[PDB]
mmCIF file with all atom_site columns, C-alpha atoms and ligand atoms in Angstrom:
data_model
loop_
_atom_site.group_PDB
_atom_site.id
_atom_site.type_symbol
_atom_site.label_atom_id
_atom_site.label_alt_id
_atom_site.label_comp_id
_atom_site.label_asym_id
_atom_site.label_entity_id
_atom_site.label_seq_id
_atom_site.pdbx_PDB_ins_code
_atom_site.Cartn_x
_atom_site.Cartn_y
_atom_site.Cartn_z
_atom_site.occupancy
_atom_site.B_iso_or_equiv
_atom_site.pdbx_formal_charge
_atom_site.auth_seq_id
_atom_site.auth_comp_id
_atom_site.auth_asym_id
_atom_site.auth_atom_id
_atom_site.pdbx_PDB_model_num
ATOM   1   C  CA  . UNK I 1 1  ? -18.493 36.419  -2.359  1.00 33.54 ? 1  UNK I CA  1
ATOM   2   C  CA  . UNK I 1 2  ? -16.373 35.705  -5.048  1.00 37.00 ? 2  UNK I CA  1
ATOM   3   C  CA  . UNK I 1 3  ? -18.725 33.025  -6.593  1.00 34.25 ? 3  UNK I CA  1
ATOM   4   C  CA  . UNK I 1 4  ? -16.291 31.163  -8.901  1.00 37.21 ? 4  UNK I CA  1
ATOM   5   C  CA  . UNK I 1 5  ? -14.771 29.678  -5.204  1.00 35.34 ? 5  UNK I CA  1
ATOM   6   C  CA  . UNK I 1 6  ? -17.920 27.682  -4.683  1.00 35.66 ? 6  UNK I CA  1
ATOM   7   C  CA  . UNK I 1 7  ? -17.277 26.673  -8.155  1.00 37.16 ? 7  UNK I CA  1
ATOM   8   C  CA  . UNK I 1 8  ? -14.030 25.385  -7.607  1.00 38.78 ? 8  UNK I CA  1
ATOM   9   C  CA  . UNK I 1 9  ? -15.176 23.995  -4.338  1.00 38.45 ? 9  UNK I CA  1
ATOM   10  C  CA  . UNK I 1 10 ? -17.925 22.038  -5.789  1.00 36.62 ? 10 UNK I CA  1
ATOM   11  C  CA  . UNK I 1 11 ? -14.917 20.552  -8.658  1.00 37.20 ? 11 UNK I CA  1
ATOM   12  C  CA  . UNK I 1 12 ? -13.460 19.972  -5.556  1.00 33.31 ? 12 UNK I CA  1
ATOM   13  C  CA  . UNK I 1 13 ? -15.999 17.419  -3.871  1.00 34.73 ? 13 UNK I CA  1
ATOM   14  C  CA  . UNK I 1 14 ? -16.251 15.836  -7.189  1.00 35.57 ? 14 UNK I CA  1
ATOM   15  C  CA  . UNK I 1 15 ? -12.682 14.663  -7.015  1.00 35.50 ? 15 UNK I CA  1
ATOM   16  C  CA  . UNK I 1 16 ? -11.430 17.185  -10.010 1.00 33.07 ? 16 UNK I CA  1
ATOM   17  C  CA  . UNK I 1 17 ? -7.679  17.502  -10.295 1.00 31.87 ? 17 UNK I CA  1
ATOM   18  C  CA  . UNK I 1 18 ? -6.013  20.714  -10.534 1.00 35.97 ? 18 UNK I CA  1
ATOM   19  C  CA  . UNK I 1 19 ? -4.891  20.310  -13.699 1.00 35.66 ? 19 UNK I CA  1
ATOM   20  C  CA  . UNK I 1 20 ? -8.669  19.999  -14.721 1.00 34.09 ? 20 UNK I CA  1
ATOM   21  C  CA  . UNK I 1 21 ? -10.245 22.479  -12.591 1.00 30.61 ? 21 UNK I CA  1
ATOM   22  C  CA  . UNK I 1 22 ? -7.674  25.299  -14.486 1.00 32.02 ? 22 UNK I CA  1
ATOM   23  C  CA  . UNK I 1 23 ? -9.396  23.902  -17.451 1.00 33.33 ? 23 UNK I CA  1
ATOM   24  C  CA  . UNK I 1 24 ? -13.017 24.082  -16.349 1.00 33.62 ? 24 UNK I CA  1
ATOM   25  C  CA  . UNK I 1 25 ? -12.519 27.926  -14.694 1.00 35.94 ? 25 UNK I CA  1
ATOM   26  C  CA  . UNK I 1 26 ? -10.479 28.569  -18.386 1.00 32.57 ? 26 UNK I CA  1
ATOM   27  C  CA  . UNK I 1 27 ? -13.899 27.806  -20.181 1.00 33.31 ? 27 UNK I CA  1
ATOM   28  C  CA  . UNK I 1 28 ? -15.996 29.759  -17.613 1.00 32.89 ? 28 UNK I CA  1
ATOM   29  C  CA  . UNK I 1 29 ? -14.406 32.909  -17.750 1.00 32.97 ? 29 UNK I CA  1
ATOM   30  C  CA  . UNK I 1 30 ? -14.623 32.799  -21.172 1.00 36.93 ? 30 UNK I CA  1
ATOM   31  C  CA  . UNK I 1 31 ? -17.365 30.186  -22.374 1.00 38.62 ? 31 UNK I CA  1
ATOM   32  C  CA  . UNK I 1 32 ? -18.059 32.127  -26.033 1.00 38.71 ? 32 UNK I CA  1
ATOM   33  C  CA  . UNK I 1 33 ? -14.435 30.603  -27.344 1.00 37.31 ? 33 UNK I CA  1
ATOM   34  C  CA  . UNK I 1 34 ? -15.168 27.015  -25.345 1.00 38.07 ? 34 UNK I CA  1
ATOM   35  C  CA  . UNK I 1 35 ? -17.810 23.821  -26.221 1.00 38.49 ? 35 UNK I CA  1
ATOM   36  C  CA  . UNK I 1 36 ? -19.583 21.175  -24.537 1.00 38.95 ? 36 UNK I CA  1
ATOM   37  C  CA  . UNK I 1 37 ? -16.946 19.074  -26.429 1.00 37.89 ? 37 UNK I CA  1
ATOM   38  C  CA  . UNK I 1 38 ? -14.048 20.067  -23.931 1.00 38.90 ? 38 UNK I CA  1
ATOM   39  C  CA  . UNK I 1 39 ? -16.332 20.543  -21.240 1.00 37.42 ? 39 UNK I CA  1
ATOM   40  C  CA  . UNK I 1 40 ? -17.383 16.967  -21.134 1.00 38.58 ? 40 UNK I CA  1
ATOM   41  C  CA  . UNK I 1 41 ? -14.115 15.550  -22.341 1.00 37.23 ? 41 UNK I CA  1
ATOM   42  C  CA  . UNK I 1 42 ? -12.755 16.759  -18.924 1.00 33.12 ? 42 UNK I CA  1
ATOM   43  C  CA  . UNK I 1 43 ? -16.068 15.307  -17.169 1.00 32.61 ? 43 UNK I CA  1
ATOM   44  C  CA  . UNK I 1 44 ? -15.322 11.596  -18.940 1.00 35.14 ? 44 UNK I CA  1
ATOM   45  C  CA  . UNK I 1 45 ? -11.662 11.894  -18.117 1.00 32.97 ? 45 UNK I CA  1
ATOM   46  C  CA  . UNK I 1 46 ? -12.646 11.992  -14.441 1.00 34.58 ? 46 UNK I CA  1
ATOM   47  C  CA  . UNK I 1 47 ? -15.320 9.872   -14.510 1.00 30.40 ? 47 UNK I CA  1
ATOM   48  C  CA  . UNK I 1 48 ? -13.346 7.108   -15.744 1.00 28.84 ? 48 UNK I CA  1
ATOM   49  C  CA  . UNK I 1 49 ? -10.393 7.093   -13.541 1.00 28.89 ? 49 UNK I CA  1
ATOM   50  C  CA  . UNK I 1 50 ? -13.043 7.268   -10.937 1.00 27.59 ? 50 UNK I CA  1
ATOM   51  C  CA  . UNK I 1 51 ? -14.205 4.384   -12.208 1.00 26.67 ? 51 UNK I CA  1
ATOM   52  C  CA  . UNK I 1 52 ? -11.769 2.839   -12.379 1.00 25.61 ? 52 UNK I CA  1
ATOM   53  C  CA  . UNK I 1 53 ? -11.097 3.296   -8.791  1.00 26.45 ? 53 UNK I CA  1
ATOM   54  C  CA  . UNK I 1 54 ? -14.090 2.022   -7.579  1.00 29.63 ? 54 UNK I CA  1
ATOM   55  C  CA  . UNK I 1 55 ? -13.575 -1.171  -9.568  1.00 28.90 ? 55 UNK I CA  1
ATOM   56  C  CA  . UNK I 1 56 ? -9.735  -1.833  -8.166  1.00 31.28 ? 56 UNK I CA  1
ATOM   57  C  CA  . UNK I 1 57 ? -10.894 -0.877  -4.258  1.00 31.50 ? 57 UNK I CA  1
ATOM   58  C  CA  . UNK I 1 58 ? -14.190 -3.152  -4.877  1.00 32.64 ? 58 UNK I CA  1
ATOM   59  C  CA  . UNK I 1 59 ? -11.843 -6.161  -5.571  1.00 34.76 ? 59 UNK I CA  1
ATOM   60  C  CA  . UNK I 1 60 ? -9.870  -5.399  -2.792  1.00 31.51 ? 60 UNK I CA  1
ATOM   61  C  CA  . UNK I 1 61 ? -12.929 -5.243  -0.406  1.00 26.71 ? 61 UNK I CA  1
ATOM   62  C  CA  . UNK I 1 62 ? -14.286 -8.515  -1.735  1.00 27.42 ? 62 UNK I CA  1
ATOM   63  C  CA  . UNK I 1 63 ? -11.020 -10.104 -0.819  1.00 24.01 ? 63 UNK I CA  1
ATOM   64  C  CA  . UNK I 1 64 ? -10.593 -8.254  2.964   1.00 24.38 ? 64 UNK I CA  1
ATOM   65  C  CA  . UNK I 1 65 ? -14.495 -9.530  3.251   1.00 23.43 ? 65 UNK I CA  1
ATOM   66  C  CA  . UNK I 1 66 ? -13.242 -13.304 2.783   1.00 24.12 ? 66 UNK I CA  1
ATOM   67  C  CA  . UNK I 1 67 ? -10.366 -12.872 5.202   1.00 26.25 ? 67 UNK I CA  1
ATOM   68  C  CA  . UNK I 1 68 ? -12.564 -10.943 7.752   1.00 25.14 ? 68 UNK I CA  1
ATOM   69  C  CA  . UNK I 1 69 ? -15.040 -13.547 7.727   1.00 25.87 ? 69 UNK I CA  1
ATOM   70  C  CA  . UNK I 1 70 ? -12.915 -16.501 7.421   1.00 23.82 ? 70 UNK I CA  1
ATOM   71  C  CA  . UNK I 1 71 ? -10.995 -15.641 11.099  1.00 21.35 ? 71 UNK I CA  1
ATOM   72  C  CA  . UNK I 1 72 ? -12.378 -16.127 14.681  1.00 21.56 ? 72 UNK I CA  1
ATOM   73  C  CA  . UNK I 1 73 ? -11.257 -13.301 16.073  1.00 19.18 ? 73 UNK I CA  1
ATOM   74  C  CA  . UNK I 1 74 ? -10.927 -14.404 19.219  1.00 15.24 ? 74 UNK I CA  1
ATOM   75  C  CA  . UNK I 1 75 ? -7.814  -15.412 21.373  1.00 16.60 ? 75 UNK I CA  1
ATOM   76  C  CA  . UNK I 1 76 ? -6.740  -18.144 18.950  1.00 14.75 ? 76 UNK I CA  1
ATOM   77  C  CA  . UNK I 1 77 ? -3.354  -18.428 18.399  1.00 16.82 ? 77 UNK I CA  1
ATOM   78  C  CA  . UNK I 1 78 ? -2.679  -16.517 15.355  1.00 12.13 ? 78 UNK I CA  1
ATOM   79  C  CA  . UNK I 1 79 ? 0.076   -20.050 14.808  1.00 11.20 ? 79 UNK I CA  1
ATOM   80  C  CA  . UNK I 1 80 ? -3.181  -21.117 13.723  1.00 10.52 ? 80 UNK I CA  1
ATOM   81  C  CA  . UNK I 1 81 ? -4.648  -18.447 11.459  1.00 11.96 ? 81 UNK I CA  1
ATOM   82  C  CA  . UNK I 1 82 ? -6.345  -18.455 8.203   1.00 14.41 ? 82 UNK I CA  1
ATOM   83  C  CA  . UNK I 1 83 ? -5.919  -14.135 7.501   1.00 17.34 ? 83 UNK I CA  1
ATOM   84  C  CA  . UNK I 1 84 ? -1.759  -15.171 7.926   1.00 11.65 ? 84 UNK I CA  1
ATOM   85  C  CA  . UNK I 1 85 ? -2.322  -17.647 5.663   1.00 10.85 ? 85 UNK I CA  1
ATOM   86  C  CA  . UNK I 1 86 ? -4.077  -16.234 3.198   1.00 14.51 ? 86 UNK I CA  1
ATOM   87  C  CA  . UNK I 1 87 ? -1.457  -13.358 2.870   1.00 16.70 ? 87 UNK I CA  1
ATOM   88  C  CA  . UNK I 1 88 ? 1.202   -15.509 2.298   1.00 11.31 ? 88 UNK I CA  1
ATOM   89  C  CA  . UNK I 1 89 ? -0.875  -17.559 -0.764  1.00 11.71 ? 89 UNK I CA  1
ATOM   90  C  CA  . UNK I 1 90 ? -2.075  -13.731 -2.114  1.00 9.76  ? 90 UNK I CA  1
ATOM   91  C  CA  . UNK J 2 1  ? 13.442  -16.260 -2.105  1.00 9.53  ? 1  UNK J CA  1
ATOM   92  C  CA  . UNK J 2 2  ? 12.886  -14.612 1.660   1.00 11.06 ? 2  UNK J CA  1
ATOM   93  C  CA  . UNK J 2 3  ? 8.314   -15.203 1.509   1.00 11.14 ? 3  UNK J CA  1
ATOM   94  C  CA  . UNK J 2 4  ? 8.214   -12.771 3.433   1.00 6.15  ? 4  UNK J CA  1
ATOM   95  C  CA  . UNK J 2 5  ? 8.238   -10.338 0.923   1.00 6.44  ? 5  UNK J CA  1
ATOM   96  C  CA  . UNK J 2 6  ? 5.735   -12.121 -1.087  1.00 6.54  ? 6  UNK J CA  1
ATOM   97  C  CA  . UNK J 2 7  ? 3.809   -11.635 2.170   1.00 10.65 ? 7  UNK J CA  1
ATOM   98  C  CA  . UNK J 2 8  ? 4.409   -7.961  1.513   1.00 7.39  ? 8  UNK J CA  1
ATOM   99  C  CA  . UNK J 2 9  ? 3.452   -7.959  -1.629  1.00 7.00  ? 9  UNK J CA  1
ATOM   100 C  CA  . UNK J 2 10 ? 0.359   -9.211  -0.801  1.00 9.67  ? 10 UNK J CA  1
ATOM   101 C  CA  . UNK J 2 11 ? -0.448  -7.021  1.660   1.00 9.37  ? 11 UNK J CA  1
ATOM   102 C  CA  . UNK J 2 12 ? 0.728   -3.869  0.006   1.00 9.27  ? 12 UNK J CA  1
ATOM   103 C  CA  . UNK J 2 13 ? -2.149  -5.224  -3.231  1.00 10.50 ? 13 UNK J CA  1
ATOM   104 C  CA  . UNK J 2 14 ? -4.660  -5.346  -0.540  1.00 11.75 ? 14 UNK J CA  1
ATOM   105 C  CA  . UNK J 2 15 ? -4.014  -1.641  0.743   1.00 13.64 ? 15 UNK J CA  1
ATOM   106 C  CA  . UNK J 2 16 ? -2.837  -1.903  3.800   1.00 14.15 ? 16 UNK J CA  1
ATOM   107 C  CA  . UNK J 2 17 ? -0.933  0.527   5.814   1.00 15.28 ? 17 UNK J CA  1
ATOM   108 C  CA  . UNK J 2 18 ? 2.826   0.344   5.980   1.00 16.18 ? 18 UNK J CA  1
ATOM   109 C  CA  . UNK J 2 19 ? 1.980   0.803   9.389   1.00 16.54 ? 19 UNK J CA  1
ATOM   110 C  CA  . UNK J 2 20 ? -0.733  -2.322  9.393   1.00 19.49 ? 20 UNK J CA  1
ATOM   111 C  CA  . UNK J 2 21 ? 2.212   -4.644  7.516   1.00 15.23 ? 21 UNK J CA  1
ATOM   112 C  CA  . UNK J 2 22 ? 4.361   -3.724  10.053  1.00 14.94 ? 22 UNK J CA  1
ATOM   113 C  CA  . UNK J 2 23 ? 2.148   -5.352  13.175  1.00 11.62 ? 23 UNK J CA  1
ATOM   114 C  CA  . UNK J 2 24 ? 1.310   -8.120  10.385  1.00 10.63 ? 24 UNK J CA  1
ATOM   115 C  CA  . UNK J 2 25 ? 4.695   -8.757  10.035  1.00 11.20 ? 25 UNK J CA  1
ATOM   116 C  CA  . UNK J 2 26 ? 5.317   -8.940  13.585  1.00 9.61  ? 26 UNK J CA  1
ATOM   117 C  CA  . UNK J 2 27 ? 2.837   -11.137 14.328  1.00 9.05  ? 27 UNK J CA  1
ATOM   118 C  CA  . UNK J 2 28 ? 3.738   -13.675 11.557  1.00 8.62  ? 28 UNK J CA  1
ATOM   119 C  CA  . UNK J 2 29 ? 7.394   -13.680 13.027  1.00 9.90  ? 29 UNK J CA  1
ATOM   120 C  CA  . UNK J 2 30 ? 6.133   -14.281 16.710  1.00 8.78  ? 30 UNK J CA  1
ATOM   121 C  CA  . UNK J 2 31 ? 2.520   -15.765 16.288  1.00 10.77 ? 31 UNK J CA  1
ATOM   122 C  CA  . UNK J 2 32 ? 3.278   -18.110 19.555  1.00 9.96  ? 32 UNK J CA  1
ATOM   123 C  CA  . UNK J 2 33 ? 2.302   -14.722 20.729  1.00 7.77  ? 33 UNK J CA  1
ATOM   124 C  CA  . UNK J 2 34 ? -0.362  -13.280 19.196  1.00 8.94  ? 34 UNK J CA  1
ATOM   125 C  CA  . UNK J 2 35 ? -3.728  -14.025 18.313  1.00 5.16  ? 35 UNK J CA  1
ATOM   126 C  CA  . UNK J 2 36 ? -6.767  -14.211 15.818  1.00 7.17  ? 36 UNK J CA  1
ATOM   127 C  CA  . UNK J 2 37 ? -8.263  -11.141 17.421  1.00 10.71 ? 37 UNK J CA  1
ATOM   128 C  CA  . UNK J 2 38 ? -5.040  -9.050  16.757  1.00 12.74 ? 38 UNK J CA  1
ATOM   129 C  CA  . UNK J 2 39 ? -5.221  -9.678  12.778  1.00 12.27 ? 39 UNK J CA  1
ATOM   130 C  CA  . UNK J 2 40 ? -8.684  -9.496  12.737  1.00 11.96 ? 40 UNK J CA  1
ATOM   131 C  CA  . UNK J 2 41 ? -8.606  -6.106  14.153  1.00 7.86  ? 41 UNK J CA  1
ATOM   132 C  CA  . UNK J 2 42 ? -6.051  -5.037  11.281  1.00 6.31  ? 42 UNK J CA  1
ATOM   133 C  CA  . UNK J 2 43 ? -8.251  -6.567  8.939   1.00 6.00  ? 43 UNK J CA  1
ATOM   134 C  CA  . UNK J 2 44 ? -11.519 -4.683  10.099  1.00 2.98  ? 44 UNK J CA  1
ATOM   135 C  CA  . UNK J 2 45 ? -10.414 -1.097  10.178  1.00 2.00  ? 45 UNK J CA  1
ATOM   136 C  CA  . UNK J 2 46 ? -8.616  -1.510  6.539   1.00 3.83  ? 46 UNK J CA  1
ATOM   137 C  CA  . UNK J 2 47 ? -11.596 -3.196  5.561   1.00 3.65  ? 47 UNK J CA  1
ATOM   138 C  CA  . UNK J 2 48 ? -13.491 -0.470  6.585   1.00 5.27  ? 48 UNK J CA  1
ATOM   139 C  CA  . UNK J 2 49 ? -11.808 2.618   5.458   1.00 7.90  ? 49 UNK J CA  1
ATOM   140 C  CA  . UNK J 2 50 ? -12.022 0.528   2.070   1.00 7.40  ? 50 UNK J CA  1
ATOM   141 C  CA  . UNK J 2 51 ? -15.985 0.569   2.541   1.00 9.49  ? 51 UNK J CA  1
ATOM   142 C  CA  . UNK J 2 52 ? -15.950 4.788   3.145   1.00 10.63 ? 52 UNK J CA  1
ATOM   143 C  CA  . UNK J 2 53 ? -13.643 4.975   0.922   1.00 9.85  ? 53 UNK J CA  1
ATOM   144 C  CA  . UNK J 2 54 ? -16.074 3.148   -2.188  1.00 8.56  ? 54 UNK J CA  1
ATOM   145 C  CA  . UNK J 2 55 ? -19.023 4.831   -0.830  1.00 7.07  ? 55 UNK J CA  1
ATOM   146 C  CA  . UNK J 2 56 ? -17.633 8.426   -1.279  1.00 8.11  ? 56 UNK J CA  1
ATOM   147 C  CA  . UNK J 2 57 ? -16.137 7.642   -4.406  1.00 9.85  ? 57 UNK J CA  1
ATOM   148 C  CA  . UNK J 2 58 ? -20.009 6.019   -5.514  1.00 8.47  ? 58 UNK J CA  1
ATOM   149 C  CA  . UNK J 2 59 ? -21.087 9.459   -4.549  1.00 10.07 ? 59 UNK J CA  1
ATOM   150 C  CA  . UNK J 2 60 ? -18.884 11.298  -6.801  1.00 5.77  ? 60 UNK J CA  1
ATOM   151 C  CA  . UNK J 2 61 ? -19.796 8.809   -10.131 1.00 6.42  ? 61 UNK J CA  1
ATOM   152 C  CA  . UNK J 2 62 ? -23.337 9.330   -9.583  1.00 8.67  ? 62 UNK J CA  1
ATOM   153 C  CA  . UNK J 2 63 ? -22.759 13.455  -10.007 1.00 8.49  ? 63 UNK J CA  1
ATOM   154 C  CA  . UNK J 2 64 ? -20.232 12.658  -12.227 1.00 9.72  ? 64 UNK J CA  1
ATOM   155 C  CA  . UNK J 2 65 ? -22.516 10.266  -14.259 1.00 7.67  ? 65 UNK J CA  1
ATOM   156 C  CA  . UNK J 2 66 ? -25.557 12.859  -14.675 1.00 10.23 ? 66 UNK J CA  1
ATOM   157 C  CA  . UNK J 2 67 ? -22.970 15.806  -15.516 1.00 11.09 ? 67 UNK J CA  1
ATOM   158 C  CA  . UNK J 2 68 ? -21.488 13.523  -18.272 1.00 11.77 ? 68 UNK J CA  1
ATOM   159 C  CA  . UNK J 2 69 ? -25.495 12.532  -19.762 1.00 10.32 ? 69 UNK J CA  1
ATOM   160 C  CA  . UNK J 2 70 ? -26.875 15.662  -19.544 1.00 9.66  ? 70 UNK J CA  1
ATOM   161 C  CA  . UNK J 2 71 ? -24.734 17.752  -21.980 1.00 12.93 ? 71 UNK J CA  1
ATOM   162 C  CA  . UNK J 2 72 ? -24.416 17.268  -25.782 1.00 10.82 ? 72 UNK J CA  1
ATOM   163 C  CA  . UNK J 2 73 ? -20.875 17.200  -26.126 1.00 12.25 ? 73 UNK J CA  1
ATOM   164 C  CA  . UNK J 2 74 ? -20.651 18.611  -29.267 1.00 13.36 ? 74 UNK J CA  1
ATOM   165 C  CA  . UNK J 2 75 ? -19.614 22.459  -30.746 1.00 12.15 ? 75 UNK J CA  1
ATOM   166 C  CA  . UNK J 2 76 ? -22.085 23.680  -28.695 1.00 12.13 ? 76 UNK J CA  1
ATOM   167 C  CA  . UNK J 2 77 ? -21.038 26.625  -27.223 1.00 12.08 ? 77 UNK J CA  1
ATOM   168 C  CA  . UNK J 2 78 ? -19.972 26.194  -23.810 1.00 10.17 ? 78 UNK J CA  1
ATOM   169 C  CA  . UNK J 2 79 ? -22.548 29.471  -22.703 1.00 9.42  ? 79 UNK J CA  1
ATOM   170 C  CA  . UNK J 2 80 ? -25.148 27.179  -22.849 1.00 11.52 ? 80 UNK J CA  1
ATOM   171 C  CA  . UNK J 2 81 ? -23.209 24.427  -21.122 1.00 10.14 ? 81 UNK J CA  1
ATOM   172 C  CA  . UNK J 2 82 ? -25.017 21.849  -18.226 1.00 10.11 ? 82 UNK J CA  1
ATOM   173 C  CA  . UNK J 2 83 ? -21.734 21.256  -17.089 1.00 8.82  ? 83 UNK J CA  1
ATOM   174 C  CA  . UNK J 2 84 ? -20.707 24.774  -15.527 1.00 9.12  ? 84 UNK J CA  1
ATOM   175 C  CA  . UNK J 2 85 ? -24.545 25.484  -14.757 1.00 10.80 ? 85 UNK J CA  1
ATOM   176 C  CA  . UNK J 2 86 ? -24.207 22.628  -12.711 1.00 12.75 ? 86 UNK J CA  1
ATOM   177 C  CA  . UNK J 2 87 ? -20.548 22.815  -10.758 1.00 9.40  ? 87 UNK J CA  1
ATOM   178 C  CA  . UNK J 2 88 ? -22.055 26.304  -10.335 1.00 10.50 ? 88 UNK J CA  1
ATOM   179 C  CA  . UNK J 2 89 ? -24.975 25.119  -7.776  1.00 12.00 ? 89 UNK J CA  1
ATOM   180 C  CA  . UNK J 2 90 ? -22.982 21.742  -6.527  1.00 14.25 ? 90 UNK J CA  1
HETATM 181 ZN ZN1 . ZN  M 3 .  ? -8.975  -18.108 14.989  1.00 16.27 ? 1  ZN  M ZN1 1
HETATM 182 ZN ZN1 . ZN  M 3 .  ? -7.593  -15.885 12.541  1.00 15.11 ? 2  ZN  M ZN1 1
HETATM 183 ZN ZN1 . ZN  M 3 .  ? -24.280 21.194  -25.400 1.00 14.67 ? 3  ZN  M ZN1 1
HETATM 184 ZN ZN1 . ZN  M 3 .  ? -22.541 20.875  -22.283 1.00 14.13 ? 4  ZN  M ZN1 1
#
């Protein structure tokens, strides 16, 4: 019950690199030489490139909604569909 | 100037599997012989690991988001951080 593993686990689910989490268990061991400065700056990094994310797979899902929609689905001759089509415009 | 590698291209920005180009590509070659339902299908399950995919990362900037508000972000020692209190419960 080494309690700094559910500490890393939890940096874990929150998408932390590795490069980060050295950072974060660097400033717990020894949090009298360490701020809320550098603490946070590592919480901002992440939260922007997962930001960031969200926004680039949200565009893509907007466009895979238009070609889901936009296709029959049934056992029309794919000579004759729009998701083909689409790909080849972009 | 071979468009099928704008076709590609296209794909690739959209996240598909080089596994889910390759059927694409097969059907566009042959689509005398394939259908609507086929790329449909492709379109559905890359559509949806998209949706999981947002939705776990939504999760994370939420936790992210309060960890980043809550602390001051300034010299204050990091023994009295929010941060590590918090990654400490999950
Ligand atoms: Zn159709
Ligand atoms: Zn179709
Ligand atoms: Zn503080
Ligand atoms: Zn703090």
């Amino acid at each position: 019950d080494l309690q700094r593993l559910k500490f890393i686990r939890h940096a874990r689910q929150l998408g932390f690199s590795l490069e980060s989490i050295r950072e974060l268990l660097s400033i717990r061991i020894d949090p009298e030489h360490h701020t809320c400065q550098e603490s946070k700056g590592i919480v901002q990094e992440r939260l922007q490139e997962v930001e960031a994310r969200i926004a680039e797979l949200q565009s893509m899902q907007r466009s895979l909604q238009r070609l889901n929609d936009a296709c029959c689905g049934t056992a029309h001759s794919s000579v004759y569909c729009s998701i083909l089509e689409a790909l080849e415009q972009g």
